[PDB]
Amino acid sequence: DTMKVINDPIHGHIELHPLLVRIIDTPQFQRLRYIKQLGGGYYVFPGASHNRFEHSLGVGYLAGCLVHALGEKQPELQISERDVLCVQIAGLCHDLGHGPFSHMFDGRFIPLARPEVKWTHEQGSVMMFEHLINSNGIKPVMEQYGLIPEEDICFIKEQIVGPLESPVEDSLWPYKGRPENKSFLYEIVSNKRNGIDVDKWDYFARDCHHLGIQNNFDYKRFIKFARVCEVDNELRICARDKEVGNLYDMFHTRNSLHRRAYQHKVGNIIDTMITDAFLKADDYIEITGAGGKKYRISTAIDDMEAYTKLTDNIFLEILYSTDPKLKDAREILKQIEYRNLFKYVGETQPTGQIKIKREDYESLPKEVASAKPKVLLDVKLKAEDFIVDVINMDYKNPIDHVSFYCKTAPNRAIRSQLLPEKFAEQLIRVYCKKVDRKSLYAARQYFVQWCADRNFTKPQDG
Amino acid sequence: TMKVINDPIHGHIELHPLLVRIIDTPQFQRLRYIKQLGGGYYVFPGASHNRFEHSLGVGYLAGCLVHALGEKQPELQISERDVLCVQIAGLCHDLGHGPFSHMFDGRFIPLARPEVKWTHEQGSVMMFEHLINSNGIKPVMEQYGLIPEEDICFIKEQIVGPLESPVEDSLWPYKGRPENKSFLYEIVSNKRNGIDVDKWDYFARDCHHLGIQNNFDYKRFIKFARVCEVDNELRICARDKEVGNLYDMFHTRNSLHRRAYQHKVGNIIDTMITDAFLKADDYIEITGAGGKKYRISTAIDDMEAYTKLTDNIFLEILYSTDPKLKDAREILKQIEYRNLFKYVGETQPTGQIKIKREDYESLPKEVASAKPKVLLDVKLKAEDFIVDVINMDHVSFPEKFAEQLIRVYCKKVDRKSLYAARQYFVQWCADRNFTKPQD
Numbered sequence A: 001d002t003m004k005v006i007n008d009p010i011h012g013h014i015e016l017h018p019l020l021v022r023i024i025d026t027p028q029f030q031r032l033r034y035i036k037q038l039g040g041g042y043y044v045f046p047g048a049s050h051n052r053f054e055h056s057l058g059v060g061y062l063a064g065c066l067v068h069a070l071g072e073k074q075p076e077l078q079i080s081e082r083d084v085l086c087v088q089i090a091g092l093c094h095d096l097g098h099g100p101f102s103h104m105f106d107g108r109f110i111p112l113a114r115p116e117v118k119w120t121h122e123q124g125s126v127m128m129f130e131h132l133i134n135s136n137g138i139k140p141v142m143e144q145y146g147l148i149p150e151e152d153i154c155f156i157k158e159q160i161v162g163p164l165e166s167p168v169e170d171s172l173w174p175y176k177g178r179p180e181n182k183s184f185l186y187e188i189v190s191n192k193r194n195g196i197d198v199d200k201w202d203y204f205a206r207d208c209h210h211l212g213i214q215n216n217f218d219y220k221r222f223i224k225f226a227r228v229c230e231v232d233n234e235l236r237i238c239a240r241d242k243e244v245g246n247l248y249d250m251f252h253t254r255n256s257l258h259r260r261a262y263q264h265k266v267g268n269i270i271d272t273m274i275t276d277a278f279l280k281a282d283d284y285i286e287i288t289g290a291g292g293k294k295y296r297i298s299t300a301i302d303d304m305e306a307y308t309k310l311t312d313n314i315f316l317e318i319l320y321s322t323d324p325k326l327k328d329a330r331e332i333l334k335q336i337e338y339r340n341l342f343k344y345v346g347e348t349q350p351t352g353q354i355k356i357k358r359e360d361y362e363s364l365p366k367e368v369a370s371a372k373p374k375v376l377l378d379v380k381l382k383a384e385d386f387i388v389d390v391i392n393m394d395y396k397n398p399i400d401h402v403s404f405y406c407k408t409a410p411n412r413a414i415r416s417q418l419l420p421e422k423f424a425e426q427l428i429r430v431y432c433k434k435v436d437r438k439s440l441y442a443a444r445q446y447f448v449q450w451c452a453d454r455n456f457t458k459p460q461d462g
Numbered sequence B: 001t002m003k004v005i006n007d008p009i010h011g012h013i014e015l016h017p018l019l020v021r022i023i024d025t026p027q028f029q030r031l032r033y034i035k036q037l038g039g040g041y042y043v044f045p046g047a048s049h050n051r052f053e054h055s056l057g058v059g060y061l062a063g064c065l066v067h068a069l070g071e072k073q074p075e076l077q078i079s080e081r082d083v084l085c086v087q088i089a090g091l092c093h094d095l096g097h098g099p100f101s102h103m104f105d106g107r108f109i110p111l112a113r114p115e116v117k118w119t120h121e122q123g124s125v126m127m128f129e130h131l132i133n134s135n136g137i138k139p140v141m142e143q144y145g146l147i148p149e150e151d152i153c154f155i156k157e158q159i160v161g162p163l164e165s166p167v168e169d170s171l172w173p174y175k176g177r178p179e180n181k182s183f184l185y186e187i188v189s190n191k192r193n194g195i196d197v198d199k200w201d202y203f204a205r206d207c208h209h210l211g212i213q214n215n216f217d218y219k220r221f222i223k224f225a226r227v228c229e230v231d232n233e234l235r236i237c238a239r240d241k242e243v244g245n246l247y248d249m250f251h252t253r254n255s256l257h258r259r260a261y262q263h264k265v266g267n268i269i270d271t272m273i274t275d276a277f278l279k280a281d282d283y284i285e286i287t288g289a290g291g292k293k294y295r296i297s298t299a300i301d302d303m304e305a306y307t308k309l310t311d312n313i314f315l316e317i318l319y320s321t322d323p324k325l326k327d328a329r330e331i332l333k334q335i336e337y338r339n340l341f342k343y344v345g346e347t348q349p350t351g352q353i354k355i356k357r358e359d360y361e362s363l364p365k366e367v368a369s370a371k372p373k374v375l376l377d378v379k380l381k382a383e384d385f386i387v388d389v390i391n392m393d394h395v396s397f398p399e400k401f402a403e404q405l406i407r408v409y410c411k412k413v414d415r416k417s418l419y420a421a422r423q424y425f426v427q428w429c430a431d432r433n434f435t436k437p438q439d
């Protein structure tokens, strides 16, 4: 067993430690070759055929790079090759939990199928990671290369999903994989506080590569000039002051990707259509899991053996099906091929109001059809004619939450409107399955009255 | 009306409504599910791209070239109708590709049905006809100024070549356009000098997705391209100062062939996928016209069934529980675990000899029949061998190259079996009179 070299269009030659290779060459990891990074965006952006597998490789590579650079610059931090391998594995496996079409699956489908359950792709990543280890004898390999499986598995899972929870006192280091003097390690793969992690670096670069958008962030420069420094008796990753411009570009790039691609109107309508087909197919598709037990699309998340076989393939399985009981679902997918899509009715925001929770998504269409427009309208619409799409931008923490250092005093952190505009953390769009112009006028009337009733933003276009 | 597409390599791409209506069909959308490089993706994580985007690019480039020629040289009499027909031909040139692209017509069908002559170009013509007739395109073509009778034939001739050659009759064989428009047949698929918009797009795109340097600039070609007479025939000619660009292109191609298309592990994996397909052929069902069920290897006889034959077959086998599919499944599972066929050696045919597809299936048997020379402890059957045949393909105004390579891999992995396989391979090369292998 020796290292391997993979040639990647974003990162060039990426070296893989044999333990990482052993983890990658499993059904549980190879599964990610069959889940598109951007879900339905590929039906708007023909270049966006990339899957979660290559992005995961990139994230592992970048995690290794950043942590090694910090160790080389600062021996005093006592970063060991064991720590590097654990951070690399966490970067590799952070997206194991994604379902078909990525953010579509846990963002919208599962809430609509089982409003009662609380599912995230991060929980799924933890579950798939455990399953991959116990299905492939990874623990002896980990030991072979100096890892301590109990502690280090806990550390990886903590990087992926976060602390054990049970806040309780909260004045105390909540993690168990590593102690406080290695806190900065938890800031590499997934950093919620300020929004700078190697995961975002890779998918910013990769999505820009595949979409045709320019990426002005130089992650390599940032890695070169990153260090560890002291803030409030804690240790954090900080950037050289001279890097401010780089960060500006990063944030702007983020904004562009969100505005032009991630919340593209037609792409999200198509995500909605695919989810509708999945909902109308859920009762009739079986996925065989542990013990030959059958599962549905919406319940495969409860058995990782079944989840392992749940990918974008399900789309085609519905499209190619001959079962009469699936015809409904099939038809919707066929409308996608013929480009007979749901009609965009409008957009609104819950500005100043409580935001819409996942557990309530299913109730929204009914609400819309229950609005009473103050005109005859001579055309009545039902709940199933409406789609309500809730688009959440998940980060209010600009550059301000970043720590900087001077080349004069590297160990200590330092104490404009040109920064990117705010994110509008929740958008609510409505589409109509009926396409005749009378039905669309009626649907718009219903939508405007519904926004009035909910005290949401008055829709534009009027 | 006029849609715009935002391609990663061509930027913004405006599309005529007729082209959009051709694209928005199951028969064309199918290409979203066929990977451009087949199994190369299992070696290059960036090579996730499919034939659909490539086809869009080829149509766009064909339009660009024809229109650029038309703006210049008005004496050629290029109508918008000609531009639209060329764009459609470029758009539809790859409709006939099967699962994993060149793996299908290049290896799988020859092994499965050694007696049929199948190519993805003739499949493209069949699928184009099926698309036209299943979605009422002819009235739309008329609506935009086309003559379906002449122009459908024109498109099919652009894709597959002359419909003729039943007898000698050596003269102008095209029926879709007169000889004075002959140059239009050189745009989408050029058989003479290997210069066409299809190659431009897929060189650029494969470079973009593989991480390989693209040294040439097709825009310079289009801007400095003209039509001129060469030996009493109209042809696409280039301003002389463009030679430096031309060479660059041929370097890129060369690199793309050596680094990616002929990658040893990628070709081994193509072979493994084909072996799985063979062991699933008796059992996989693909519903076709009238509800008749087809196999993978016979789905090419019904375009309705072929419309539903894509890379998904792979996963259909991987996810199956039918015990009859177990063997196929296991091969795919080995791919996931990276327990691959072992590489035994490489050789070349001598002189102009070219092994033909109809004989591919005979090659392993031959290898297992060679008498090694000394003796052997382990004996290997024909099923233990894979013989992989790899092929590679005067412009008017530097590396290995070998018309055919034959590589042998072994399925048994132990050292003893691999030594035996090497002995078989070297003897077989001696018996066919092929070049003695390496080492």
Ligand SMILES: Nc1nc2c(ncn2[C@H]2C[C@H](O)[C@@H](COP(=O)(O)OCCCNC(=O)c3cccc(-c4cccc(Br)c4)c3)O2)c(=O)[nH]1
Pocket: A043, A044, A045, A046, A266, A339, A340, A341, A342, A343, A344, A435, B003, B004, B005, B020, B023, B024
């Ligand atoms: N066409 C296409 N575009 C593609 C493709 N790959 C990427 N693109 C890029 C370029 C496009 O400009 C962009 C956005 O898509 P769009 O189709 O132009 O629609 C935009 C408006 C919202 N869409 C609908 O509501 C709609 C649209 C069209 C028809 C119908 C309809 C018609 C009859 C009955 C019914 Br019932 C529904 C509804 O995506 C592709 O393969 N095909």
Ligand SMILES: Nc1nc2c(ncn2[C@H]2C[C@H](O)[C@@H](COP(=O)(O)OCCCNC(=O)c3cccc(-c4cccc(Br)c4)c3)O2)c(=O)[nH]1
Pocket: A004, A005, A006, A021, A024, A025, B041, B042, B043, B044, B045, B265, B338, B339, B340, B341, B342, B343, B413
């Ligand atoms: N691993 C991986 N690499 C990947 C991946 N995506 C791209 N790559 C790039 C990086 C790699 O350097 C390059 C080439 O692939 P390789 O896996 O390194 O194998 C090279 C020789 C193949 N030939 C064999 O026969 C072989 C090889 C190894 C083991 C066995 C074997 C072992 C036990 C029993 C049996 Br029975 C067979 C056989 O592909 C990926 O997902 N995974």
Ligand SMILES: [Fe+3]
Pocket: A055, A059, A094, A095, A199, A203
């Ligand atoms: Fe990620």
Ligand SMILES: [Fe+3]
Pocket: B054, B058, B093, B094, B198, B202
């Ligand atoms: Fe092509």
